[PDB]
Amino acid sequence: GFFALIPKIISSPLFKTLLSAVGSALSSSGGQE
């Protein structure tokens, strides 16, 4: 952390990974295609 949004400011250098993770957990997993 840092002050308040530091964990969100890295949305690009951090969330897109959780998103790539979800894109694989929702597009790959969940759907199972």
From Swiss-Prot:
Primary localization class, coarse: secreted
Any one biological process term the GO annotation gives: monoatomic ion transport
Record-level GO cellular component terms: extracellular region; membrane; other organism cell membrane
Key words of the record: Ion transport, Membrane, Secreted, Target cell membrane, Target membrane, Toxin, Transmembrane, Transport
Pfam assignment, any one: Pardaxin
Top-level taxon of the source organism: Eukaryota
Annotated function: Exhibits unusual shark repellent and surfactant properties. Forms voltage-dependent, ion-permeable channels in membranes. At high concentration causes cell membrane lysis.
This protein's name: Pardaxin P-4
Lineage: Eukaryota, Metazoa, Chordata, Craniata, Vertebrata
